[PDB]
Write a protein that binds this ligand. Structure first.
Ligand SMILES: CC(C)CN(Cc1ccc(-c2ccc(S(C)(=O)=O)cc2)s1)S(=O)(=O)Cc1ccccc1
Length: 234
Protein backbone atom coordinates (compact mmCIF):
# COMPACT_ATOMS: atom_id res chain seq x y z
CA UNK A 1 0.00 0.00 0.00
CA UNK A 2 1.15 3.52 -0.87
CA UNK A 3 1.43 6.34 1.69
CA UNK A 4 -1.61 7.88 -0.01
CA UNK A 5 -3.69 4.81 0.83
CA UNK A 6 -2.19 4.50 4.30
CA UNK A 7 -3.34 8.06 4.96
CA UNK A 8 -6.82 7.20 3.73
CA UNK A 9 -6.88 4.21 6.13
CA UNK A 10 -5.85 6.65 8.90
CA UNK A 11 -8.74 9.02 8.04
CA UNK A 12 -11.20 6.18 7.72
CA UNK A 13 -10.29 4.65 11.12
CA UNK A 14 -10.50 8.03 12.86
CA UNK A 15 -13.90 8.80 11.29
CA UNK A 16 -15.24 5.39 12.38
CA UNK A 17 -14.08 6.17 15.90
CA UNK A 18 -15.67 9.62 15.99
CA UNK A 19 -19.02 8.10 14.87
CA UNK A 20 -18.88 5.48 17.61
CA UNK A 21 -17.01 7.20 20.44
CA UNK A 22 -20.22 7.15 22.51
CA UNK A 23 -19.56 10.30 24.56
CA UNK A 24 -18.04 13.43 22.98
CA UNK A 25 -14.67 14.40 24.43
CA UNK A 26 -15.91 17.99 24.42
CA UNK A 27 -18.79 17.07 26.73
CA UNK A 28 -16.60 14.96 29.03
CA UNK A 29 -14.10 17.80 29.49
CA UNK A 30 -16.86 20.36 30.00
CA UNK A 31 -18.61 18.29 32.68
CA UNK A 32 -15.46 17.92 34.79
CA UNK A 33 -16.84 20.46 37.28
CA UNK A 34 -20.12 18.59 37.72
CA UNK A 35 -18.90 16.37 40.58
CA UNK A 36 -20.92 14.13 42.91
CA UNK A 37 -21.63 15.73 46.29
CA UNK A 38 -20.80 13.83 49.48
CA UNK A 39 -24.49 13.04 49.90
CA UNK A 40 -24.58 11.70 46.37
CA UNK A 41 -21.49 9.55 46.95
CA UNK A 42 -23.13 8.20 50.12
CA UNK A 43 -26.24 7.43 48.11
CA UNK A 44 -24.17 5.25 45.79
CA UNK A 45 -22.33 3.59 48.68
CA UNK A 46 -25.63 2.52 50.31
CA UNK A 47 -26.83 0.64 47.24
CA UNK A 48 -26.53 -3.13 47.16
CA UNK A 49 -23.68 -4.67 45.19
CA UNK A 50 -26.55 -6.08 43.09
CA UNK A 51 -27.85 -2.64 42.18
CA UNK A 52 -24.36 -1.24 41.42
CA UNK A 53 -23.70 -4.34 39.37
CA UNK A 54 -26.79 -3.81 37.26
CA UNK A 55 -25.96 -0.16 36.65
CA UNK A 56 -22.36 -1.16 35.79
CA UNK A 57 -23.56 -4.02 33.61
CA UNK A 58 -25.82 -1.62 31.73
CA UNK A 59 -22.95 0.84 31.08
CA UNK A 60 -20.47 -1.87 30.08
CA UNK A 61 -22.93 -3.57 27.73
CA UNK A 62 -23.64 -0.25 26.09
CA UNK A 63 -19.89 0.58 25.82
CA UNK A 64 -19.33 -2.81 24.23
CA UNK A 65 -22.13 -2.17 21.68
CA UNK A 66 -20.27 0.99 20.58
CA UNK A 67 -17.01 -0.99 20.30
CA UNK A 68 -18.75 -3.58 18.12
CA UNK A 69 -20.10 -0.78 15.91
CA UNK A 70 -16.56 0.67 15.63
CA UNK A 71 -15.22 -2.72 14.49
CA UNK A 72 -17.95 -3.12 11.89
CA UNK A 73 -16.98 0.25 10.39
CA UNK A 74 -13.30 -0.67 10.35
CA UNK A 75 -11.99 -1.17 6.83
CA UNK A 76 -11.66 -4.88 6.12
CA UNK A 77 -13.30 -6.09 9.35
CA UNK A 78 -16.63 -7.01 7.72
CA UNK A 79 -14.68 -8.79 4.98
CA UNK A 80 -13.43 -11.32 7.56
CA UNK A 81 -15.38 -14.54 8.04
CA UNK A 82 -18.00 -14.52 10.80
CA UNK A 83 -16.01 -16.83 13.07
CA UNK A 84 -13.05 -14.49 12.94
CA UNK A 85 -15.13 -11.37 13.60
CA UNK A 86 -16.44 -13.10 16.71
CA UNK A 87 -13.03 -14.33 17.84
CA UNK A 88 -11.57 -10.81 17.57
CA UNK A 89 -14.43 -9.03 19.38
CA UNK A 90 -14.74 -11.68 22.05
CA UNK A 91 -11.02 -11.38 22.83
CA UNK A 92 -10.70 -7.63 22.43
CA UNK A 93 -13.90 -5.63 23.06
CA UNK A 94 -13.48 -5.28 26.82
CA UNK A 95 -9.81 -4.25 26.42
CA UNK A 96 -10.96 -1.48 24.02
CA UNK A 97 -13.61 -0.36 26.54
CA UNK A 98 -10.87 -0.10 29.21
CA UNK A 99 -8.73 2.04 26.87
CA UNK A 100 -11.70 4.19 25.87
CA UNK A 101 -12.40 4.84 29.55
CA UNK A 102 -9.32 7.07 29.86
CA UNK A 103 -11.23 9.85 28.05
CA UNK A 104 -13.78 9.97 30.85
CA UNK A 105 -11.05 10.02 33.48
CA UNK A 106 -9.90 13.24 35.17
CA UNK A 107 -6.33 12.95 36.48
CA UNK A 108 -6.54 16.30 38.31
CA UNK A 109 -8.78 14.87 41.03
CA UNK A 110 -8.82 11.14 40.18
CA UNK A 111 -12.49 11.01 39.25
CA UNK A 112 -14.34 9.29 36.41
CA UNK A 113 -17.54 10.26 34.55
CA UNK A 114 -20.38 7.99 35.68
CA UNK A 115 -24.15 8.46 35.34
CA UNK A 116 -23.91 12.17 34.68
CA UNK A 117 -21.26 13.35 37.10
CA UNK A 118 -17.64 12.75 38.09
CA UNK A 119 -16.89 10.48 41.06
CA UNK A 120 -13.80 9.01 42.73
CA UNK A 121 -13.24 5.28 43.22
CA UNK A 122 -15.08 5.37 46.57
CA UNK A 123 -18.30 5.75 44.55
CA UNK A 124 -17.99 2.01 43.74
CA UNK A 125 -17.44 0.81 47.31
CA UNK A 126 -20.60 -1.37 47.44
CA UNK A 127 -19.06 -3.70 44.82
CA UNK A 128 -16.44 -4.80 47.33
CA UNK A 129 -13.58 -4.97 44.85
CA UNK A 130 -11.27 -2.09 45.74
CA UNK A 131 -8.23 -3.65 44.08
CA UNK A 132 -9.81 -3.96 40.65
CA UNK A 133 -11.35 -0.48 40.76
CA UNK A 134 -8.01 0.91 41.94
CA UNK A 135 -6.18 -0.94 39.12
CA UNK A 136 -8.66 0.43 36.60
CA UNK A 137 -8.18 3.98 37.94
CA UNK A 138 -4.34 3.64 37.88
CA UNK A 139 -4.42 2.29 34.34
CA UNK A 140 -6.60 5.21 33.18
CA UNK A 141 -4.29 7.58 35.04
CA UNK A 142 -1.29 6.22 33.14
CA UNK A 143 -3.07 6.80 29.81
CA UNK A 144 -4.34 10.28 30.68
CA UNK A 145 -0.78 11.33 31.47
CA UNK A 146 0.02 10.87 27.76
CA UNK A 147 -2.83 13.18 26.68
CA UNK A 148 -3.97 10.48 24.26
CA UNK A 149 -5.64 12.31 21.37
CA UNK A 150 -8.95 11.15 19.86
CA UNK A 151 -7.16 9.85 16.76
CA UNK A 152 -4.47 7.99 18.76
CA UNK A 153 -7.27 6.23 20.66
CA UNK A 154 -8.91 5.42 17.33
CA UNK A 155 -5.76 3.93 15.83
CA UNK A 156 -4.57 2.22 19.01
CA UNK A 157 -7.91 0.54 19.79
CA UNK A 158 -8.21 -0.64 16.19
CA UNK A 159 -4.95 -2.53 16.83
CA UNK A 160 -6.15 -3.88 20.18
CA UNK A 161 -8.98 -5.51 18.15
CA UNK A 162 -7.12 -6.48 14.99
CA UNK A 163 -4.61 -8.90 16.48
CA UNK A 164 -3.64 -11.89 14.40
CA UNK A 165 -2.44 -13.94 17.38
CA UNK A 166 -5.92 -14.42 18.86
CA UNK A 167 -6.27 -18.19 19.11
CA UNK A 168 -9.13 -19.69 17.11
CA UNK A 169 -8.75 -17.68 13.94
CA UNK A 170 -9.65 -19.46 10.72
CA UNK A 171 -8.20 -16.90 8.30
CA UNK A 172 -5.11 -15.78 10.22
CA UNK A 173 -3.43 -14.44 7.06
CA UNK A 174 -6.28 -12.02 6.41
CA UNK A 175 -6.10 -10.71 9.96
CA UNK A 176 -2.32 -10.36 9.64
CA UNK A 177 -2.70 -8.22 6.55
CA UNK A 178 -5.32 -6.05 8.22
CA UNK A 179 -3.15 -5.71 11.35
CA UNK A 180 -0.04 -4.77 9.35
CA UNK A 181 -1.99 -2.13 7.43
CA UNK A 182 -3.31 -0.65 10.67
CA UNK A 183 0.23 -0.64 12.13
CA UNK A 184 1.42 1.34 9.07
CA UNK A 185 -1.48 3.72 9.63
CA UNK A 186 -0.72 4.18 13.33
CA UNK A 187 3.06 4.66 12.89
CA UNK A 188 2.72 6.97 9.92
CA UNK A 189 0.15 9.09 11.74
CA UNK A 190 2.37 9.41 14.83
CA UNK A 191 5.11 10.76 12.47
CA UNK A 192 2.70 13.22 10.84
CA UNK A 193 1.63 14.50 14.24
CA UNK A 194 5.11 14.49 15.89
CA UNK A 195 3.88 12.02 18.46
CA UNK A 196 6.47 9.27 17.97
CA UNK A 197 7.28 9.61 21.67
CA UNK A 198 4.11 7.89 22.85
CA UNK A 199 4.90 4.42 21.43
CA UNK A 200 7.46 3.58 24.12
CA UNK A 201 5.22 5.09 26.80
CA UNK A 202 2.15 2.98 25.89
CA UNK A 203 1.03 0.25 28.27
CA UNK A 204 2.53 -3.17 27.48
CA UNK A 205 0.04 -5.45 25.65
CA UNK A 206 0.29 -7.86 28.59
CA UNK A 207 -0.87 -5.22 31.07
CA UNK A 208 -4.12 -4.56 29.19
CA UNK A 209 -4.54 -8.35 29.03
CA UNK A 210 -3.99 -9.01 32.72
CA UNK A 211 -6.24 -6.09 33.66
CA UNK A 212 -9.08 -7.16 31.35
CA UNK A 213 -8.73 -10.72 32.64
CA UNK A 214 -9.14 -9.54 36.25
CA UNK A 215 -12.01 -7.32 35.12
CA UNK A 216 -13.81 -10.15 33.23
CA UNK A 217 -13.58 -12.41 36.31
CA UNK A 218 -15.71 -9.98 38.35
CA UNK A 219 -18.19 -9.53 35.51
CA UNK A 220 -18.78 -13.27 35.23
CA UNK A 221 -19.38 -13.65 38.96
CA UNK A 222 -21.94 -10.84 38.95
CA UNK A 223 -23.70 -11.70 35.65
CA UNK A 224 -24.11 -15.35 36.64
CA UNK A 225 -26.46 -14.53 39.52
CA UNK A 226 -27.90 -11.29 38.08
CA UNK A 227 -28.22 -11.16 34.27
CA UNK A 228 -29.76 -8.00 32.77
CA UNK A 229 -31.40 -7.76 29.35
CA UNK A 230 -30.74 -4.20 28.12
CA UNK A 231 -31.54 -2.31 24.88
CA UNK A 232 -29.30 -2.25 21.82
CA UNK A 233 -27.81 1.05 20.69
CA UNK A 234 -27.45 0.38 16.96
C1 LIG B 1 -15.63 3.75 36.10
C2 LIG B 1 -15.24 2.27 36.15
C3 LIG B 1 -13.94 2.15 36.96
C4 LIG B 1 -16.32 1.47 36.87
N1 LIG B 1 -17.30 0.84 35.96
C5 LIG B 1 -18.44 1.61 35.44
C6 LIG B 1 -18.34 2.06 33.99
C7 LIG B 1 -18.67 1.30 32.93
C8 LIG B 1 -18.52 1.91 31.70
C9 LIG B 1 -18.08 3.19 31.75
C10 LIG B 1 -17.79 4.03 30.57
C11 LIG B 1 -18.55 3.96 29.40
C12 LIG B 1 -18.21 4.74 28.32
C13 LIG B 1 -17.11 5.59 28.38
S1 LIG B 1 -16.69 6.57 26.99
C14 LIG B 1 -18.30 6.86 26.26
O1 LIG B 1 -16.11 7.75 27.51
O2 LIG B 1 -15.95 5.70 26.14
C15 LIG B 1 -16.35 5.65 29.52
C16 LIG B 1 -16.68 4.88 30.62
S2 LIG B 1 -17.81 3.65 33.42
S3 LIG B 1 -17.13 -0.79 35.64
O3 LIG B 1 -18.45 -1.21 35.34
O4 LIG B 1 -16.11 -0.88 34.66
C17 LIG B 1 -16.57 -1.49 37.23
C18 LIG B 1 -17.05 -2.90 37.53
C19 LIG B 1 -18.37 -3.15 37.84
C20 LIG B 1 -18.81 -4.44 38.13
C21 LIG B 1 -17.91 -5.49 38.11
C22 LIG B 1 -16.59 -5.24 37.80
C23 LIG B 1 -16.15 -3.95 37.52
Amino acid sequence: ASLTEIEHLVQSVCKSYRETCQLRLEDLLRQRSNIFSREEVTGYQRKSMWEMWERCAHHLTEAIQYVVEFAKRLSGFMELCQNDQIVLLKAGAMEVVLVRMCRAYNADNRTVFFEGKYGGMELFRALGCSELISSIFDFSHSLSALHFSEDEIALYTALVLINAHRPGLQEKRKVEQLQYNLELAFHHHLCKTHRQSILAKLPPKGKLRSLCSQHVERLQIFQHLHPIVVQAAF
